[PDB]
Amino acid sequence: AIIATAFAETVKFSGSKQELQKRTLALYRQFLRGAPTFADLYEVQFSIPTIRTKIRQEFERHRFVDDLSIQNVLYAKGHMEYQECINFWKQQAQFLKYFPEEDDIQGRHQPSNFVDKFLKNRA
C-alpha cells in the first residue's frame, strides 16, 4: 500500500492545543463543504441545512473537553468518519444512523415524569 486513499491524512499528534484547534477548524470546514455531496450521494429525503446542523451539533457535543490527548483521539475518529462519508463507502442505512429521531416519530406515550415511566417500568 504505497499510495494512500484520496482524502487520507497521515495520523499525527499535536502537542499544542492551538494547532489542534486549527485542525478541528479546518475539519469543520471540510464537513461543511461536503454536505451537498452527502445529500446527493445518499439520496436523503430532507434538506442540506439539516446535515449542516447535525455537523454543528456533533461538534457542540465535545466542546468543553479539557484533555489534549482525548481531543486528539476525538479528532482522529472524526477525520476517519469524514473519509468514510466523503468517499461513499458508508451506505445510506449507516449514514442514517446519524438521524434516528428525524425519520419517524416512534409513537405515542413518551414517558417524562415518574408516573409515566412507572406505569411501563421504564420499558
Binding site: 446527493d40 450521494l41 461513499f88 451506505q91
Partner: protein, 127 residues
C-alpha cells in the same frame, strides 16, 4: 409476391408477438429499489465523464479506411476475367499502396497500449 418478402415482413411479426406475450402475460409490479442499474449489489455515484485511451478510439477510426479498401476490391473480383493481365497489375499496385500505409501503422504501434508497470529500471547508486 415472391417468398423473399414474406420473410422480411414475417420475422418482425414473430418478434412483436413474443414481446407482446411478455408484456401481456408477466406482472409489472416495480418500485424504487428494484429500479437502478446493477453493479455487484452496491450502488455508487457515476462520474459525469471519464477518460479513455487513444487506441480505443483509434481502432474504430482506423477501421473505416481498411473497410473502404475491402469494398474497393469488390468491383475487381467480379470483373477479374475481362481485365486479364492488365487490371491485375493495377490491383497489385493498389494493394501495395495500401500495404505501405499499413506497415506505417504497424511500425508506429498505434493500436498498442503500453503498461506503466515499470520494474524500476534504475539501479542503486549510493552517496
Amino acid at each position: 409476391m415472391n417468398t423473399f418478402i414474406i420473410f422480411i415482413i414475417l420475422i418482425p411479426i414473430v418478434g412483436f408477438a413474443l414481446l407482446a406475450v411478455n408484456i401481456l402475460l408477466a406482472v409489472y409490479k416495480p418500485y424504487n429499489e428494484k429500479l437502478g442499474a446493477f453493479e455487484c449489489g452496491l450502488t455508487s455515484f457515476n462520474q459525469t465523464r471519464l477518460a479513455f485511451n487513444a487506441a480505443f478510439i483509434l481502432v474504430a477510426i482506423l477501421f473505416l479506411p481498411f473497410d473502404l479498401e475491402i469494398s474497393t476490391l469488390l468491383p475487381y473480383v467480379m470483373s477479374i476475367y475481362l481485365v486479364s493481365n492488365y487490371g491485375f497489375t493495377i490491383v497489385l499496385l493498389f494493394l501495395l499502396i495500401l500495404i505501405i500505409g499499413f506497415v506505417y501503422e504497424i511500425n508506429t504501434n498505434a493500436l498498442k497500449i503500453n503498461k506503466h508497470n515499470k520494474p524500476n529500471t534504475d539501479s542503486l547508486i549510493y552517496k
